[PDB]
Structure 1
């Protein structure tokens, strides 16, 4: 469980980059509303219903500071992001929809760079 190689760090990023920077057919960068969560004092409901919240920043941070040991351990936090999103949003609502798409992007992006 000793120094996170640079090679592994080099992946996590580009993966989470591939994701963040993804722009759809119309060209809308889907990540926009996932980067920063909204405030407890803005959307208290979210933090009532979502027991273990998360956004992208807080995933990037955890990359930056070598918390994540394997690519597995990242997927989980990206997956929990979308789970959360889906859980809070109305099926067929643009928020709800993006999370899915992104979910896939990662899995292909991770595939395309990982084992």
Structure 2
């Protein structure tokens, strides 16, 4: 099973870490201005595109991932990875390979990992 009440609110050292990563991933750009996270901001409704929810297991978005950090939901950094990686995979599953949205997914990932290290942390 799993347990861990949300007694005290995550510290500034942890919360910040989460933000840094994402804040960088979502802000990360590839084209000459055309961001990628754009197509990863909001998702299609269940009525318009239901099939999406049929194949996709957990169609999560970015607005939700962030809403959690501010909701003291995520217990540890790992949790963030579970979603972040999910929000990406979901795409590679829907969007064809070597496609426009595809490549992006792969990129966002490379940025996520790097972020963890390359951040505001300045000894």
2: distance between equivalents of 1:43 and 1:17?
Answer: 28
- Structure 1 residue 58: deviation in Å? 0.8
Q: State which structure, 1 or 2, has the greater radius of gyration over its C-alpha atoms.
A: 2
1: distance between equivalents of 2:99 and 2:31?
Answer: 18
1: distance between equivalents of 2:52 and 2:103?
Answer: 18
The 5-angstrom pairing of residues 1-115 of structure 1 reads 2-112=8-118
- Structure 1 residue 81: deviation in Å? 0.8
1: distance between equivalents of 2:58 and 2:16?
Answer: 27
- Structure 1 residue 55: deviation in Å? 0.6
2: distance between equivalents of 1:3 and 1:28?
Answer: 36
- Structure 1 residue 25: deviation in Å? 4.2
- Structure 1 residue 91: deviation in Å? 0.2
Please state whether the residue corresponding to 1:57 is helix, strand or coil: helix
Listed as ranges, the gaps of 5+ residues in structure 2 are: 1-7
Q: TM-score by structure 2 length?
A: 0.84
Cα RMSD (Å): 2.0
Q: TM-score by structure 1 length?
A: 0.90
Listed as ranges, the gaps of 5+ residues in structure 1 are: none
Q: Which runs of 4+ in 1 moved over 2 A?
A: none
